[PDB]
Design a protein around this ligand. Sequence first.
Ligand SMILES: Nc1ncnc2c1ncn2[C@@H]1O[C@H](COP(=O)(O)OP(=O)(O)OP(=O)(O)O)[C@@H](O)[C@H]1O
Ligand code: SF4
Ligand SMILES: [Mg+2]
Length: 310
Amino acid sequence: SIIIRVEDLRAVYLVREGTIKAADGISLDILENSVTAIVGESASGKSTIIEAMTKTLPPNGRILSGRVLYKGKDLLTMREEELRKIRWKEIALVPQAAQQSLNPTMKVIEHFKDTVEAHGVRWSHSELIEKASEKLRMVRLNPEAVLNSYPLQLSGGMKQRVLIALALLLDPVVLILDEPTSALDVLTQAHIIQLLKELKKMLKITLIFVTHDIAVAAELADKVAVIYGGNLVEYNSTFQIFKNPLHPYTRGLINSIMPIPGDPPSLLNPPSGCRFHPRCEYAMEICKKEKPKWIRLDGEAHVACHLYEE
Ligand SMILES: Nc1ncnc2c1ncn2[C@@H]1O[C@H](COP(=O)(O)OP(=O)(O)OP(=O)(O)O)[C@@H](O)[C@H]1O
Ligand code: SF4
Ligand SMILES: [Mg+2]
Protein backbone atom coordinates (compact mmCIF):
# COMPACT_ATOMS: atom_id res chain seq x y z
CA SER A 1 0.00 0.00 0.00
CA ILE A 2 1.12 3.55 -0.50
CA ILE A 3 0.54 5.16 2.86
CA ILE A 4 1.81 8.55 1.75
CA ARG A 5 1.93 10.11 -1.72
CA VAL A 6 4.01 13.29 -2.05
CA GLU A 7 2.92 14.95 -5.32
CA ASP A 8 4.90 17.80 -6.89
CA LEU A 9 6.09 19.52 -3.73
CA ARG A 10 7.52 23.00 -4.23
CA ALA A 11 8.50 24.59 -0.94
CA VAL A 12 10.87 27.56 -0.59
CA TYR A 13 12.42 29.88 2.00
CA LEU A 14 11.47 33.54 1.56
CA VAL A 15 14.64 35.55 2.00
CA ARG A 16 15.64 39.22 1.48
CA GLU A 17 17.43 38.56 -1.81
CA GLY A 18 14.75 36.24 -3.21
CA THR A 19 13.75 32.59 -2.68
CA ILE A 20 15.61 29.51 -1.47
CA LYS A 21 14.61 26.62 -3.62
CA ALA A 22 15.25 23.72 -1.30
CA ALA A 23 12.54 21.07 -1.83
CA ASP A 24 11.97 22.05 -5.51
CA GLY A 25 9.34 19.90 -7.24
CA ILE A 26 9.26 16.73 -5.22
CA SER A 27 7.16 13.62 -5.78
CA LEU A 28 7.59 10.23 -4.08
CA ASP A 29 5.60 7.29 -2.77
CA ILE A 30 6.07 5.92 0.75
CA LEU A 31 5.30 2.20 0.96
CA GLU A 32 2.89 1.38 3.76
CA ASN A 33 5.20 -0.54 6.07
CA SER A 34 8.53 0.31 4.53
CA VAL A 35 11.58 2.04 5.83
CA THR A 36 12.39 4.90 3.45
CA ALA A 37 15.63 6.80 3.84
CA ILE A 38 16.05 10.39 2.63
CA VAL A 39 19.72 10.90 1.86
CA GLY A 40 21.85 13.78 0.61
CA GLU A 41 24.78 15.91 1.76
CA SER A 42 24.64 18.90 4.12
CA ALA A 43 22.26 21.70 3.31
CA SER A 44 20.58 19.93 0.39
CA GLY A 45 16.90 20.14 1.36
CA LYS A 46 16.40 16.98 3.46
CA SER A 47 15.01 18.67 6.58
CA THR A 48 13.10 21.04 4.32
CA ILE A 49 11.21 18.24 2.59
CA ILE A 50 10.56 16.63 5.93
CA GLU A 51 9.22 19.89 7.33
CA ALA A 52 7.16 20.71 4.29
CA MET A 53 5.57 17.29 4.50
CA THR A 54 4.65 17.77 8.14
CA LYS A 55 3.60 21.42 7.83
CA THR A 56 6.35 22.21 10.35
CA LEU A 57 8.08 24.79 8.14
CA PRO A 58 9.42 27.92 9.86
CA PRO A 59 7.65 31.33 9.69
CA ASN A 60 10.17 31.88 6.98
CA GLY A 61 9.35 28.86 4.81
CA ARG A 62 6.35 28.77 2.47
CA ILE A 63 4.87 26.01 0.37
CA LEU A 64 4.39 27.01 -3.23
CA SER A 65 2.73 23.95 -4.73
CA GLY A 66 1.71 20.31 -4.57
CA ARG A 67 -0.06 17.74 -2.42
CA VAL A 68 0.75 15.19 0.23
CA LEU A 69 -1.78 12.38 0.53
CA TYR A 70 -2.19 10.30 3.65
CA LYS A 71 -5.01 7.78 3.21
CA GLY A 72 -5.63 9.53 -0.11
CA LYS A 73 -6.49 12.78 1.69
CA ASP A 74 -4.41 15.96 1.34
CA LEU A 75 -2.60 17.04 4.51
CA LEU A 76 -1.85 20.45 3.10
CA THR A 77 -5.27 22.10 2.76
CA MET A 78 -6.72 20.30 5.75
CA ARG A 79 -8.94 21.72 8.41
CA GLU A 80 -6.74 22.08 11.49
CA GLU A 81 -9.59 20.36 13.33
CA GLU A 82 -8.94 17.41 11.05
CA LEU A 83 -5.16 17.96 11.34
CA ARG A 84 -5.08 17.75 15.15
CA LYS A 85 -6.46 14.17 15.06
CA ILE A 86 -3.78 13.12 12.59
CA ARG A 87 -0.79 14.70 14.32
CA TRP A 88 0.92 12.75 17.14
CA LYS A 89 -1.82 10.08 16.92
CA GLU A 90 -1.05 9.00 13.37
CA ILE A 91 2.01 10.80 12.01
CA ALA A 92 4.84 11.70 14.39
CA LEU A 93 8.01 13.65 13.96
CA VAL A 94 11.23 13.79 15.89
CA PRO A 95 12.96 16.77 14.05
CA GLN A 96 16.57 17.94 13.61
CA ALA A 97 18.18 18.41 17.03
CA ALA A 98 14.78 18.41 18.79
CA GLN A 99 16.92 17.87 21.86
CA GLN A 100 17.19 21.66 21.94
CA SER A 101 13.38 21.63 22.45
CA LEU A 102 13.99 20.01 25.83
CA ASN A 103 14.02 22.88 28.29
CA PRO A 104 16.46 21.64 30.93
CA THR A 105 14.95 22.98 34.14
CA MET A 106 12.18 20.44 33.53
CA LYS A 107 12.01 16.77 34.45
CA VAL A 108 11.49 14.52 31.43
CA ILE A 109 8.08 13.52 32.77
CA GLU A 110 7.15 17.11 32.15
CA HIS A 111 8.14 17.07 28.47
CA PHE A 112 5.92 14.04 28.17
CA LYS A 113 3.08 15.86 29.90
CA ASP A 114 3.66 19.07 27.83
CA THR A 115 3.48 16.89 24.69
CA VAL A 116 0.34 14.93 25.68
CA GLU A 117 -1.46 18.08 26.85
CA ALA A 118 -0.55 20.06 23.77
CA HIS A 119 -1.94 17.36 21.46
CA GLY A 120 -5.33 17.44 23.21
CA VAL A 121 -5.54 13.98 24.87
CA ARG A 122 -6.35 13.99 28.59
CA TRP A 123 -4.71 11.37 30.81
CA SER A 124 -4.48 10.98 34.56
CA HIS A 125 -0.94 11.87 35.64
CA SER A 126 -0.47 8.30 36.90
CA GLU A 127 -1.81 6.82 33.64
CA LEU A 128 0.66 9.08 31.77
CA ILE A 129 3.40 7.65 33.98
CA GLU A 130 2.23 4.18 32.87
CA LYS A 131 2.21 4.82 29.14
CA ALA A 132 5.42 6.84 29.22
CA SER A 133 7.21 4.11 31.20
CA GLU A 134 5.95 1.56 28.71
CA LYS A 135 7.48 3.34 25.68
CA LEU A 136 10.57 4.17 27.70
CA ARG A 137 10.93 0.43 28.06
CA MET A 138 10.41 -0.10 24.31
CA VAL A 139 13.48 2.11 23.87
CA ARG A 140 15.45 0.19 26.53
CA LEU A 141 15.49 2.94 29.18
CA ASN A 142 14.91 2.97 32.95
CA PRO A 143 11.42 4.56 33.12
CA GLU A 144 11.79 5.49 36.77
CA ALA A 145 15.26 7.05 36.65
CA VAL A 146 14.65 8.78 33.34
CA LEU A 147 11.23 10.36 33.83
CA ASN A 148 12.49 11.83 37.07
CA SER A 149 15.72 13.30 35.75
CA TYR A 150 16.58 16.53 33.92
CA PRO A 151 17.62 16.65 30.24
CA LEU A 152 21.09 17.89 31.11
CA GLN A 153 21.66 14.64 33.04
CA LEU A 154 21.21 12.51 29.93
CA SER A 155 23.65 11.50 27.22
CA GLY A 156 22.87 12.37 23.60
CA GLY A 157 22.08 8.69 23.08
CA MET A 158 19.64 8.81 25.97
CA LYS A 159 18.15 12.15 24.93
CA GLN A 160 17.52 10.51 21.52
CA ARG A 161 15.92 7.45 23.07
CA VAL A 162 13.64 9.79 25.09
CA LEU A 163 12.69 11.78 21.98
CA ILE A 164 11.68 8.60 20.16
CA ALA A 165 9.69 7.26 23.11
CA LEU A 166 7.94 10.62 23.12
CA ALA A 167 7.02 10.21 19.44
CA LEU A 168 5.74 6.65 19.99
CA LEU A 169 3.56 7.73 22.94
CA LEU A 170 0.27 7.68 21.02
CA ASP A 171 1.01 4.67 18.81
CA PRO A 172 1.58 6.43 15.48
CA VAL A 173 1.35 4.63 12.14
CA VAL A 174 4.13 6.71 10.56
CA LEU A 175 7.29 7.74 12.39
CA ILE A 176 9.51 10.43 10.90
CA LEU A 177 13.08 11.08 12.03
CA ASP A 178 15.52 13.81 10.99
CA GLU A 179 19.30 13.31 11.37
CA PRO A 180 18.39 10.99 14.27
CA THR A 181 21.94 9.89 14.87
CA SER A 182 24.22 12.83 14.00
CA ALA A 183 26.25 14.56 16.71
CA LEU A 184 26.54 11.17 18.39
CA ASP A 185 29.59 8.97 18.87
CA VAL A 186 30.15 5.97 16.63
CA LEU A 187 29.10 3.24 19.10
CA THR A 188 25.88 4.82 20.42
CA GLN A 189 24.99 5.75 16.86
CA ALA A 190 25.23 2.01 16.22
CA HIS A 191 22.97 1.32 19.22
CA ILE A 192 20.38 3.78 18.04
CA ILE A 193 20.35 2.10 14.64
CA GLN A 194 19.98 -1.30 16.34
CA LEU A 195 17.08 0.01 18.38
CA LEU A 196 15.49 1.40 15.19
CA LYS A 197 15.74 -2.08 13.67
CA GLU A 198 14.15 -3.57 16.81
CA LEU A 199 11.19 -1.20 16.73
CA LYS A 200 10.94 -1.72 12.94
CA LYS A 201 10.27 -5.43 13.55
CA MET A 202 8.38 -5.16 16.86
CA LEU A 203 5.88 -2.54 15.61
CA LYS A 204 3.55 -2.09 12.69
CA ILE A 205 4.66 1.33 11.31
CA THR A 206 5.90 3.16 8.27
CA LEU A 207 9.35 4.52 9.11
CA ILE A 208 10.76 7.53 7.27
CA PHE A 209 14.16 8.81 8.30
CA VAL A 210 16.75 11.29 7.13
CA THR A 211 20.49 10.86 7.04
CA HIS A 212 23.57 12.14 5.24
CA ASP A 213 25.41 8.85 5.63
CA ILE A 214 24.44 6.27 2.96
CA ALA A 215 25.97 3.50 5.10
CA VAL A 216 23.31 4.26 7.72
CA ALA A 217 20.53 4.11 5.16
CA ALA A 218 21.71 0.66 3.90
CA GLU A 219 21.86 -0.49 7.47
CA LEU A 220 18.19 0.40 7.82
CA ALA A 221 16.18 1.06 4.75
CA ASP A 222 14.12 -0.71 2.10
CA LYS A 223 13.82 2.16 -0.33
CA VAL A 224 16.20 5.10 -0.63
CA ALA A 225 15.62 8.62 -1.92
CA VAL A 226 18.55 10.74 -2.97
CA ILE A 227 18.24 14.49 -2.94
CA TYR A 228 20.71 16.95 -4.51
CA GLY A 229 20.39 20.71 -4.25
CA GLY A 230 16.63 20.82 -3.55
CA ASN A 231 15.74 18.08 -6.05
CA LEU A 232 14.68 14.43 -5.83
CA VAL A 233 17.35 12.96 -8.03
CA GLU A 234 16.69 9.19 -7.61
CA TYR A 235 14.56 6.61 -5.81
CA ASN A 236 15.29 2.84 -5.63
CA SER A 237 15.46 -0.09 -3.20
CA THR A 238 18.70 -0.08 -1.13
CA PHE A 239 20.19 -3.10 -2.75
CA GLN A 240 19.40 -1.76 -6.24
CA ILE A 241 20.87 1.66 -5.35
CA PHE A 242 24.23 -0.03 -4.58
CA LYS A 243 23.94 -2.57 -7.38
CA ASN A 244 22.54 -0.31 -10.10
CA PRO A 245 22.68 3.38 -9.22
CA LEU A 246 21.14 5.49 -11.98
CA HIS A 247 21.71 9.25 -11.48
CA PRO A 248 25.37 10.23 -12.20
CA TYR A 249 25.38 11.97 -8.80
CA THR A 250 24.31 8.76 -7.08
CA ARG A 251 26.81 6.63 -9.03
CA GLY A 252 29.47 9.05 -7.94
CA LEU A 253 28.35 8.53 -4.32
CA ILE A 254 28.42 4.74 -4.44
CA ASN A 255 31.86 4.76 -6.13
CA SER A 256 33.07 7.40 -3.69
CA ILE A 257 32.04 4.82 -1.09
CA MET A 258 34.14 1.86 -2.34
CA PRO A 259 35.55 13.16 -3.42
CA ILE A 260 33.33 14.31 -6.32
CA PRO A 261 34.82 17.30 -8.17
CA GLY A 262 32.71 20.45 -7.90
CA ASP A 263 31.05 22.64 -5.30
CA PRO A 264 27.46 22.30 -4.16
CA PRO A 265 24.96 24.58 -5.97
CA SER A 266 23.70 27.93 -4.63
CA LEU A 267 20.06 27.31 -3.73
CA LEU A 268 19.18 30.97 -4.18
CA ASN A 269 20.72 31.13 -7.65
CA PRO A 270 20.83 27.45 -8.69
CA PRO A 271 21.94 26.23 -12.07
CA SER A 272 19.30 25.77 -14.75
CA GLY A 273 17.69 22.49 -15.81
CA CYS A 274 19.51 19.78 -13.96
CA ARG A 275 21.34 21.38 -11.03
CA PHE A 276 23.90 18.55 -11.17
CA HIS A 277 25.10 19.44 -14.68
CA PRO A 278 28.03 21.68 -13.58
CA ARG A 279 29.54 18.65 -11.86
CA CYS A 280 28.10 15.89 -14.02
CA GLU A 281 30.53 14.17 -16.40
CA TYR A 282 27.66 13.23 -18.75
CA ALA A 283 26.37 16.81 -18.91
CA MET A 284 24.66 17.93 -22.14
CA GLU A 285 22.89 20.96 -23.59
CA ILE A 286 19.43 19.75 -22.67
CA CYS A 287 20.79 19.26 -19.13
CA LYS A 288 21.25 23.03 -18.77
CA LYS A 289 18.19 24.04 -20.76
CA GLU A 290 15.78 21.67 -19.07
CA LYS A 291 15.03 19.98 -15.72
CA PRO A 292 15.09 16.21 -16.30
CA LYS A 293 11.63 14.73 -15.68
CA TRP A 294 10.97 12.51 -12.65
CA ILE A 295 10.43 9.12 -14.30
CA ARG A 296 9.46 5.55 -13.53
CA LEU A 297 11.81 3.10 -15.28
CA ASP A 298 11.85 -0.50 -14.05
CA GLY A 299 10.11 -1.83 -10.97
CA GLU A 300 10.71 0.21 -7.83
CA ALA A 301 13.09 2.56 -9.67
CA HIS A 302 12.82 6.30 -10.41
CA VAL A 303 15.28 8.88 -11.78
CA ALA A 304 15.32 12.43 -12.96
CA CYS A 305 17.94 12.43 -15.65
CA HIS A 306 18.05 13.05 -19.37
CA LEU A 307 20.11 9.88 -19.91
CA TYR A 308 17.01 7.80 -19.17
CA GLU A 309 13.39 7.26 -20.28
CA GLU A 310 10.32 5.09 -19.56
N1 LIG B 1 14.52 29.36 7.42
C1 LIG B 1 15.39 29.37 6.37
N2 LIG B 1 15.57 30.47 5.62
C2 LIG B 1 16.42 30.50 4.57
N3 LIG B 1 17.18 29.47 4.19
C3 LIG B 1 17.09 28.29 4.86
C4 LIG B 1 16.18 28.18 6.01
N4 LIG B 1 16.31 26.91 6.46
C5 LIG B 1 17.22 26.28 5.68
N5 LIG B 1 17.65 27.09 4.72
C6 LIG B 1 18.66 26.78 3.71
O1 LIG B 1 18.19 25.96 2.65
C7 LIG B 1 19.18 24.96 2.38
C8 LIG B 1 18.61 23.56 2.69
O2 LIG B 1 18.49 23.40 4.11
P1 LIG B 1 18.06 22.02 4.81
O3 LIG B 1 18.08 22.20 6.32
O4 LIG B 1 16.84 21.48 4.12
O5 LIG B 1 19.30 21.09 4.40
P2 LIG B 1 19.58 19.67 5.09
O6 LIG B 1 19.44 18.69 3.95
O7 LIG B 1 18.78 19.58 6.37
O8 LIG B 1 21.12 19.77 5.54
P3 LIG B 1 21.51 20.02 7.08
O9 LIG B 1 20.38 19.36 7.82
O10 LIG B 1 22.79 19.25 7.21
O11 LIG B 1 21.64 21.52 7.21
C9 LIG B 1 20.38 25.23 3.29
O12 LIG B 1 21.41 25.99 2.65
C10 LIG B 1 19.78 26.05 4.42
O13 LIG B 1 20.71 26.93 5.08
S1 SF4 C 1 20.55 15.17 -16.18
FE1 SF4 C 1 22.08 15.69 -17.64
S2 SF4 C 1 23.46 16.57 -16.19
FE2 SF4 C 1 21.95 16.04 -14.77
S3 SF4 C 1 22.82 14.10 -14.32
FE3 SF4 C 1 21.58 13.26 -15.89
S4 SF4 C 1 23.06 13.75 -17.37
FE4 SF4 C 1 24.30 14.62 -15.80
MG1 LIG D 1 18.73 17.29 7.75
